[PDB]
Amino acid sequence: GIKRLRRLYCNVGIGFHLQALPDGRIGGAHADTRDSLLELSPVERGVVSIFGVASRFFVAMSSKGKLYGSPFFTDECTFKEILLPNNYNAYESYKYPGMFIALGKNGKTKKGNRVSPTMKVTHFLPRL
């Protein structure tokens, strides 16, 4: 079926959308940048892949909790999409339980093993 193309907004700092850059880096952008358009594709129930449409990189997380861009699909590119209050979602590494995607108030990524789902830095609101 169809796959939704959206932006994942983290309400920290001035507000940032998760984005994948053309050089393989992952970060945040306040504006609705082309690199922040993400294709969310279901892998299995409750699990999704997050693909940067423009950069052509999947968002991935290493065993050390580091978010990075993967040019090809792997087992480090899958995340459990967990519903939170007020329609926000947390994204937990499928391969490494307990690690979550997160952006800090400075608009940069945080290590997945240094944040918990109760923290705002792991809360993403699906938008446009």
UniProtKB/Swiss-Prot annotation:
Subcellular location: Secreted
Chief location category: secreted
A single GO BP: positive regulation of gene expression
Top-rank taxon, per record: Eukaryota
Any single Gene Ontology cellular-component annotation: extracellular space
Keywords: Developmental protein, Differentiation, Growth factor, Heparin-binding, Mitogen, Proto-oncogene, Secreted, Signal
GO molecular function: fibroblast growth factor receptor binding; growth factor activity; heparin binding
Transmembrane segments: none
Residue ranges of coiled coil: none
Subunit-level organization: Interacts with FGFR1, FGFR2, FGFR3 and FGFR4. Affinity between fibroblast growth factors (FGFs) and their receptors is increased by heparan sulfate glycosaminoglycans that function as coreceptors.
Its biological purpose: Plays an important role in the regulation of embryonic development, cell proliferation, and cell differentiation. Required for normal limb and cardiac valve development during embryogenesis. May play a role in embryonic molar tooth bud development via inducing the expression of MSX1, MSX2 and MSX1-mediated expression of SDC1 in dental mesenchyme cells.
Family affiliation: Belongs to the heparin-binding growth factors family.
UniProt protein name: Fibroblast growth factor 4
Source organism (scientific name): Homo sapiens
Lineage of source species: Eukaryota, Metazoa, Chordata, Craniata, Vertebrata
